[PDB]
Amino acid sequence: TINYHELETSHGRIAVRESEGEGAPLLMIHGNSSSGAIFAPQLEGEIGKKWRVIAPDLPGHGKSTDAIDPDRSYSMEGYADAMTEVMQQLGIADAVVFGWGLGGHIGIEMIARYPEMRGLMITGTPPVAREEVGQGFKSGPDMALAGQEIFSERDVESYARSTCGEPFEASLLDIVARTDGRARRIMFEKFGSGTGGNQRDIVAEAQLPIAVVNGRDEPFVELDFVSKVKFGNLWEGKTHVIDNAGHAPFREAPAEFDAYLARFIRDCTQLEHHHHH
Ligand SMILES: CCCCCC(=O)N[C@H]1CCOC1=O
């Protein structure tokens, strides 16, 4: 019952999946070398049955084309531009946004570009200034692949297994193998070059509700660091941790993840929130 269609955008042709839900819209943004197909549990499950879930593929990812201009598109801020253009074409100005990994960093960059965003949930994403990368992320061989252009077959498998967690499915290899490797290299370099907004300052100053939900056994993100990040309006007043999940709780522990996501959507769309400045 998923509505699949493609949009011609200034970045290239962007693939979009939409759930059947009549309720408030939720944009879900996938991570590095993934695709919106990863959000099957939300798209096809109870979240997507109630709310209008939109899960696009970033340029260079999934069923989208490679970027027309990699130098423009393949960066946290460039992806944020692309997603903002997608939402404009879909006529949706006030989505709640969920971002996974790279997708969470993209969501942070979207705050300035998508002013009627009703909330942002980030999973697998430490808001960090460029000089804080070592504090926010755990060092390791799979983390090292995040910025590597060319993946071998073994790289594809290792990266898919670590980023997606249990259960591994063969379809994941196809998603990761497709990714335009230039996107990994350029996005990583540009983060290091400080090309976009300072994410630490952005989340500290943002007035919209920001929710933080992670798997307890995160292999990429330093949860203690994340629990100390200053947020302007931290949803439910703390960062949340789900047992028996790692980098991808939305698929590893869907029931528990969906409880948080559903409640966040309810809060962001049913309660008053004020911008005092
Ligand atoms: C340069 C900092 C890391 C960039 C963000 C990133 O690539 N995060 C990956 C890690 C696992 O899944 C992702 O999307």
Numbering used by the authors: 2 to 278
Question: What do the study authors state?
Answer:
We further determined the crystal structure of the inactive mutant AidHS102G in complex with C6-HSL (AidHS102G–C6-HSL). Conforming to our predictions, the catalytic triad mutations S102G and H248G disabled AidH from degrading AHLs. Furthermore, in the structure of the complex of AidH and its substrate C6-HSL, each AidH molecule binds one substrate molecule in the active site. The carbonyl O atom in the C6-HSL lactone ring forms hydrogen bonds to the backbones of Asn33 and Leu103, and the Oδ1 atom interacts with the hydroxyl O atom of Tyr160 via a hydrogen bond. To evaluate the role of the nucleophile Ser102 of the catalytic triad in substrate binding, we modelled a hydroxyl group on the side chain of the mutated Gly102 according to the conformation of Ser102 in wild-type AidH. The hydroxyl O atom of Ser102 forms hydrogen bonds to the carbonyl O atom of the lactone ring of the substrate and the N atom of the acyl chain of the substrate with lengths of 2.89 and 2.67 Å, respectively. The distance between the hydroxyl O atom of Ser102 and the carbonyl C atom of the C6-HSL lactone ring (2.52 Å) suggests that this C atom is likely to be the target when the nucleophile Ser102 attacks the substrate. One water molecule, W1, close to the lactone ring of the substrate is present in the structure of the AidH–substrate complex. The entrance to the substrate-binding tunnel is in the open state upon substrate or product binding.
